[PDB]
Design a protein around this ligand. Structure first.
Ligand code: NI
Ligand SMILES: [Zn+2]
Length: 464
């Protein structure tokens, strides 16, 4: 069974989960996607109204990525089925004059606070249209939405579901339905993710139930008011930022004029999603002893132009920790800074295996090897690599696509006899019997992680 149902058919939700499950996202892919989302949200700061909505957007998407199997099926579907990539989507908080109040207001900059304060959800002068749209100039996917509500307002988890909804429209291409008592495939998909993440949301007859529409007007009206409450001392600076973004313009990328978030503290601010004991990653606006920060680029700072995911972005500092590549980064950056790479005559890294100024070795198929030392390449910021806890001259192999393959270690005896670890799913795996090349890479030269980061040793590889 595989008829592609129409984008508006409820059975299209089943079509997305059934095809997205065919290609499960490995650990390397979840780590790539989480780092791509963090970057997309950061690059969206000029269009987000405040640090609160910016943090709510990022942690909502990362929480779903980590703890919602259906969200992973949805995101996987898009990659394999010519829809949008989760990291490609940018976010806007574009407000506009309510159509029923446009006889008095001709600019967003005219509406005062008391015009919103002394109003109701149906006649509020400012409205934001939740929409999965495209920037007509560049063709980039955008998600438009209103500001995030107060954490314990009782509305926040529905705002969360509402954001996942608009993303579902991009990564699955599904549509919504007008029909009575029908939720539609996008709303079905979003509600599954919300159910898995324990997000409490209200239920209605269908997507176009008038009761549903009135409740959304209420949620978005209260979120705008909760947001104003958040900025009681900088209302002038907040309204100017709102008006700038409202006219499709880029406002401060670092929220410069807004400072009142520090006084409010972490306590009432969105929390980073829960993660494994072996996870390196944290919040954006507050840093351990907690103390708020004004540097925003530093967490998504790319390490080197040569270390990137294929067809993706350059690996950020956390990417190396989460993928067990800190020893690999140190030894690669070492040869690439020292004596460079020297081309020896062996067909591949496998053929080589079978028969100060740190150097590197390039093979005939493009693959390469790097030097490993217990003294210089076993450190405190290299210690956490899982091959270290598991169980010294080594030569770590990288395939023709510059991806990590294996790490072969030896001690000063039995010159020979040593230890071997293999790279699979963002981790190193101890393979005791040293014949693993015939029993693992049987008739192949490539790494066991086809999603692992690329360590482009020589600049010309960027062309092939
Ligand atoms: Ni794209
Ligand atoms: Zn929709």
């Amino acid at each position: 069974n595989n008829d592609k149902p129409d984008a508006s058919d409820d059975k299209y939700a089943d079509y997305v989960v059934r095809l997205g499950s065919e290609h499960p996202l490995n650990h390397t892919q979840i780590i790539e996607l989480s780092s791509a989302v963090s970057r997309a949200v950061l690059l969206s700061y000029p269009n987000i109204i405040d640090r609160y909505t910016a943090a709510a957007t990022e942690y909502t998407v990362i929480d779903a990525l980590f703890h919602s199997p259906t969200f992973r099926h949805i995101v996987s579907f898009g990659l394999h089925n010519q829809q949008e990539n989760l990291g490609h989507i940018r976010y806007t908080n574009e407000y506009e004059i309510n159509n029923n109040r446009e006889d008095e207001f001709s600019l967003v900059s005219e509406v005062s606070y008391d015009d919103i304060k002394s109003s109701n959800a149906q006649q509020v002068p400012l409205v934001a249209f939740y929409e999965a749209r495209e920037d007509r100039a560049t063709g980039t996917p955008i998600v438009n939405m209103g500001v995030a509500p107060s954490l314990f307002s009782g509305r926040y988890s529905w705002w969360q579901e509402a954001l996942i909804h608009e993303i579902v429209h991009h990564v699955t291409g599904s549509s919504d339905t007008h029909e009575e008592n029908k939720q539609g495939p996008t709303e079905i998909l979003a509600q599954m993710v919300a159910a898995e993440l324990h997000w409490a949301i209200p239920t209605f007859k269908g997507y176009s139930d008038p009761a549903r529409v009135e409740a959304i007007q209420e949620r978005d009206f209260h979120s705008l008011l909760n947001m104003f409450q958040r900025h009681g001392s900088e209302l002038g600076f907040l309204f100017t930022r709102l008006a700038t973004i409202a006219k499709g313009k880029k406002a401060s990328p670092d929220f410069g004029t807004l400072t009142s978030f520090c006084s409010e503290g972490i306590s009432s601010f969105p929390k980073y999603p829960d993660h494994d004991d072996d996870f390196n990653g944290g919040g954006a606006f507050f840093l351990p002893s907690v103390e708020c920060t004004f540097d925003v680029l530093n967490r998504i700072e790319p390490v080197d132009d040569s270390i990137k995911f294929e067809g993706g972005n350059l690996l950020i500092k956390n990417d190396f920790k989460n993928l067990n590549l800190r020893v690999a980064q140190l030894s690669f950056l070492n040869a690439k800074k020292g004596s460079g790479f020297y081309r020896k005559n062996w067909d591949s890294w496998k053929s080589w295996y079978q028969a100060y100024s740190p150097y590197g070795i390039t093979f005939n198929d493009g693959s390469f090897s790097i030097g490993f030392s217990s003294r210089k390449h076993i450190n405190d910021n290299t210690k956490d690599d899982n091959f270290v806890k598991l169980n010294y001259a080594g030569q770590m192999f990288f395939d023709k696509n510059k991806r990590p393959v294996a790490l072969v270690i030896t001690e000063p005896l039995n010159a020979g006899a040593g230890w071997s670890y293999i790279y699979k799913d963002g981790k190193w795996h101890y393979e005791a019997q040293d014949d693993w090349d015939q029993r693992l890479f049987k008739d192949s030269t490539l790494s066991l992680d086809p999603h692992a980061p690329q360590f482009i040793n020589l600049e010309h590889h960027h062309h092939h």
